[PDB]
């Protein structure tokens, strides 16, 4: 599957979108999980699957939330693998 | 081969669209059948084939309905198989 936003395929391309990140979740962990800020509160989107997540709680792990809400994502799959995703769903 | 609404691929992603689901058919049951709510009345839709189903009667099985009307859904085929689908018909 081809990423929804190819220009966000790169870590840095995504990272910069968090500029001055004023939220509880580490922007670098967000960017490593394929997300980039939309420029709306704390809303982020995956460059590959297009999935979007908002209202991030303090100690939430970007990869975990990505797996929970979008196990369909191919990027998630390439980097994490089946097990990881299956485990997130017991 | 590719689902019409890819974001709704996970169970939880479809389930969450219910919550305020005050109708006969079990929401947990629908979601597993590949459905999620349009938020408009009781109208539901399959994330994969995109076939919408409405005017739900009490005690109806989502999977049963899915197979009856949209026998050609590839999500249906992956999960249920032939025997099921052909049996329903």
């Amino acid at each position: 599957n081809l990423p929804r936003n190819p220009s966000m395929t790169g870590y840095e391309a995504r990272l910069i979108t968090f500029g001055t990140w004023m939220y509880s979740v580490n922007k670098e962990q967000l960017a490593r999980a394929g997300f980039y800020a939309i420029g709306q509160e704390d809303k982020v989107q995956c460059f590959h699957c297009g999935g979007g997540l908002a209202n991030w709680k303090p100690k939430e792990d970007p990869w975990e939330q990505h797996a929970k809400w979008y196990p369909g994502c191919k990027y998630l799959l390439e980097e994490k693998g089946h097990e990881y995703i299956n485990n997130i769903h017991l | 081969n590719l689902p019409r609404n890819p974001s709704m691929t996970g169970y939880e992603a479809r389930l969450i669209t219910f919550g305020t689901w005050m109708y006969s058919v079990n929401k947990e049951q629908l979601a597993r059948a590949g459905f999620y709510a349009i938020g408009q009345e009781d109208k539901v839709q399959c994330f994969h084939c995109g076939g919408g189903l409405a005017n739900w009667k009490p005690k109806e099985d989502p999977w049963e309905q899915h197979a009856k009307w949209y026998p050609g859904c590839k999500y249906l085929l992956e999960e249920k198989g032939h025997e099921y689908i052909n049996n329903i018909h």
């Binding site: 809303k43 989107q45 999935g51 979007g52 997540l53 908002a54 209202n55 991030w56 939430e60 809400w69 | -």
Partner: peptide, 5 residues
């Protein structure tokens, strides 16, 4: 976190 409308 939660999905976006």
């Amino acid at each position: 976190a939660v999905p976006i409308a």
